[PDB]
Design a protein around this ligand. Structure first.
Ligand SMILES: C[C@]12CCc3c(ccc4cc(O)ccc34)[C@@H]1CCC2=O
Ligand SMILES: C[C@]12CCc3c(ccc4cc(O)ccc34)[C@@H]1CCC2=O
Lengths: 127, 128
């Protein structure tokens, strides 16, 4: 595909959440451009390229324990970009916890994620 | 106020929405920095300066019964930035409509909005 339309951005970013929820690291790495830049959380030093991205996601999702689901519709632009609200559920201190996040993504002319910024901090972590 | 903390970004960005909701263009322009940049919707040319920002909110808020409310918590960083999901309700040539939007904001070391990006398009519009 080329630069995703607004409707295609909605589908791609929803698909990314489904892949995070099932914990398929390889499928996520494939969604990213080979030289993608990721800032998670935004304000922290970026990581770059599929090698660093694969390591980051496997550290986060390798155990398959995390769950993720959209908490609102994906907002999409006409220049291949979008932003989405979601909630992440995992284990912290034994008790279950929930983290509210917004990801901003820009896609390239091949339909792959070129950049991603994940906005969240401890003020978004419940229980 | 200095560079807003994460908790302070949450309050500031929530404060912006309720200002949009009540339609106080004066109060909203004051929240913006003198040389702020606004991309609304994201993908179009950015606008600069408070006069140009003033006129933008005039066009959008100064007429139709525009209301706005958060549809989720404000996500805040530790570098003075945040993102929030909200819904704009409008009446568009008779048709009651709603628009789902996510705003990304960067605040200055004075607690003013330095940059704003509003993500939405027609796919996010619905008839009520
Ligand atoms: C890593 C993590 C699980 C997944 C996750 C987190 C934060 C932001 C994310 C953003 C994403 O786009 C996808 C997944 C996460 C959590 C923070 C702590 C934790 O357990
Ligand atoms: C301008 C507008 C009303 C307000 C509004 C829109 C879009 C994005 C916004 C982002 C904001 O942070 C505040 C207000 C709006 C609408 C698009 C169509 C319309 O009438």
């Amino acid at each position: 595909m080329n630069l995703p339309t607004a409707q295609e951005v909605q589908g791609l970013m929803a698909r990314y959440i489904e892949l995070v929820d099932v914990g398929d690291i390889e499928a996520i790495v494939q969604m990213y451009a080979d030289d993608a830049t990721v800032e998670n959380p935004f304000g922290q030093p970026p990581i770059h390229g599929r090698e660093q991205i694969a390591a980051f996601y496997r550290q986060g999702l390798g155990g398959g324990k995390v769950r993720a689901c959209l908490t609102g519709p994906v907002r999409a632009s006409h220049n291949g970009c979008g932003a989405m609200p979601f909630r992440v559920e995992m284990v912290w201190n034994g008790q279950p916890c929930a983290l509210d996040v917004i990801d901003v993504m820009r896609f390239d002319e091949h339909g792959r994620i070129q950049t991603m910024q994940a906005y969240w901090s401890e003020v978004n972590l419940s229980v």
